């Protein structure tokens with residue numbers, strides 16, 4: 448990891464121009480704020496935010512995998528804390544599912560590669576005894592070849608008083624304070640429902656507001672929910688991915704499959 452001085456990161460991000468890229472600024476998104484930078488011949492991602500910063504570096508130093516984002520460097524010039532990453536041209540899975548900024552809809556073929564890639568990333572994390580604690584489509588980034596790269600390891604862990612994560616993706620025991628890798632499985636089940644439907648996990652102007660509630664709705668079909676912005680989706684593979692998501696979303700943590708089974712099932716699907 449390269450140690451950058453804050454001034455270097457100031458200059459490459461147009462003094463952290465917080466305006467969105469579309470408006471002429473450098474902001475890519477927020478969780479801290481993510482800025483586009485240009486360091487020499489390289490386009491980079493600069494996250495300007497301490498325990499979460501030290502944890503992000505700690506996890507990245509140990510975890511290097513093609514389905515995890517790569518940390519290039521950092522900056523800790525007192526007050527301001529920055530994390531520098533390899534640039535992901537196709538942004539997040541959330542934005543590609545919503546076709547934000549007019550990007551074309553992802554094909555079913557591509558969606559299957561993304562789901563498999565994301566499962567391989569979680570498997571590496573779990574094999575290396577790490578619980579992500581914030582698995583969501585906004586944290587699944589896409590490179591130039593649409594290779595799934597898991598991001599945001601600031602809250603990662605090797606019961607708690609401080610409950611953290613994204614409510615719409617969280618398992619019941621996670622909402623209660625339990626720290627378990629079985630909780631990441633549940634959240635991935637929500638991500639698989641987003642991949643199938645193209646619907647966000649939460650929508651205030653929707654019935655049901657929460658995507659995970661459609662599983663109970665179907666248990667009373669998935670064909671009605673399949674993303675219509677695809678022409679290469681076959682019922683056999685869609686139902687097979689839904690079966691994986693359904694198993695992931697079992698409300699009883701011990702009845703959910705481990706990431707290795709999830710990988711195996713996603714492999715058997717294609």
Ligand SMILES: CC(C)Oc1cc2c(O[C@@H]3CCCNC3)ccnc2cc1C(N)=O
Nearest residue numbers: 476477478492494532534535538539585598
């Ligand atoms: C590792 C991380 C800093 O990298 C990125 C984050 C991105 C993003 O972040 C949102 C806020 C943080 C939570 N995720 C959503 C949205 C859209 N595109 C993003 C591209 C990158 C990248 N490295 O090119």
